Amino acid sequence: NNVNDLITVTKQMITEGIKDDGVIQAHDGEHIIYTSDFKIDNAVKAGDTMTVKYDKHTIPSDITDDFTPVDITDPSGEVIAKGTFDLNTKTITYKFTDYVDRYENVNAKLELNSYIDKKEVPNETNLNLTFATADKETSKNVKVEYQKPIVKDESNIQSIFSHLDTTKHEVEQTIYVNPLKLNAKNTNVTIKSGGVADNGDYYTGDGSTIIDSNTEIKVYKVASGQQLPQSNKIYDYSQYEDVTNSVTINKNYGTNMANINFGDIDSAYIVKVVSKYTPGAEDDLAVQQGVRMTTTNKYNYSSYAGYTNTILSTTDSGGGDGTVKP
Amino acid sequence: SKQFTSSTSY
Ligand SMILES: [Mg+2]
Incomplete structure (x- = not known):
């Protein structure tokens, strides 16, 4: 029940967590911020899924193994979607709740933090980071420094x-x-x-x-x-x-x-x-x-x-x- | 919850 085609991304960007200088200072713990704003079609129903893809060279947590995607919630705490993370594909799958059966004109905003994945980046290098929301990609060139x-x-x-x-x-x-x-x-x-x-x-x-x-x-x-x-x-x-x-x-x-x-x-x-x-x-x-x-x-x-x-x-x-x- | 990384103290 993938409905990526029913997700309209209206804004997305990649920004640096400590200083905007085109260089990820990974050993200073500098994170990468991926922000995505999107509309959810009215045809989307409970149990449908969308994906969010991290760049292969990034990872939600650098030193812990316990990452769980944040719920997408409305202003009073209703859960719009529950997320699961696949480390191997570096992908979150968000599964909509029956929130989308009860509401329409639904939109959402994701702010996802990540770090350089040291397994994918053993040494200093230049990277073309690419993130995606519902298969709509955005990119950013950075240098990784250790x-x-x-x-x-x-x-x-x-x-x-x-x-x-x-x-x-x-x-x-x-x-x-x-x-x-x-x-x-x-x-x-x-x-x-x-x-x-x-x-x-x-x-x-x-x-x-x-x-x-x-x-x-x-x-x-x-x-x-x-x-x-x-x-x-x-x-x-x-x-x-x-x-x-x-x-x-x-x-x-x-x-x-x-x-x-x-x-x-x-x-x-x-x-x-x-x-x-x-x-x-x-x-x-x-x-x-x-x-x-x-x-x-x-x-x-x-x-x-x-x-x-x-x-x-x-x-x-x-x-x-x-x-x-x- | 939170996600974590290593940093350097100075
Ligand atoms: Mg920087």
Whole structure:
């Protein structure tokens, strides 16, 4: 019962969530906003469906798996349509309720947020984004930019939050240690709740995590000819060398603070940390965790590099209205 | 509900 041909799109556009500069700052958490205004033909009836298509390179939620499309509701809360999302086709199917049997001259407005899908965009690139409402397409050219490591002599590090589970209250951090493959002497990495400044200085910050013996920490060695994705997200760990049992890990080094002793290294490593957080903290954006890399430089003192992640959120909207059928 | 992403603190 697809009625895309009965949906008339009167306005649609793609806009950037933080700054209109033609560049999606994906590691700054910059979202993409797709807005669509459309009319629903009077012939549309309960159970009929329409579709909304996201660009293949975008995804409604970057770090959670729990996306459910927002209802389309009228001003008093009547549900006009219920939506289901197919991740594989990047498509919402909206199914109309008997609202459309009781009202006519029905129109609706969708505001759908999305992020760069790191699986589809492993490295920086130019994209021609194309979104669609009921098969009516609109496009926007953008560049995707990712972050760079903080570099101080041979200390060089970067990290992202790569997953968030709001049911089990776990957050996953993916850390690139020495991505530049430098000769990093006496390498130690600290992971801590709250903040680590670019120069390694600790700060309390505005979020927290819980780090203890039940924190999960895995460490992988990257070969000299292996290239890490700029997205900072690893979807398959199988081609890297698991060296978790060959480095020293102290999950209780300090208060909510773990550290890893690497010694002298000449290679990049990936560290994946799964820590807990305070239930509900995601609604206050109060989940924050940082990393510090220390090495000994050629002048016999320590060089530090720091990196901190936090979370951002968006909320879709779907509204409509109509006049009562006599 | 909400949809989420990772960001950088500075
Ligand atoms: Mg921008």
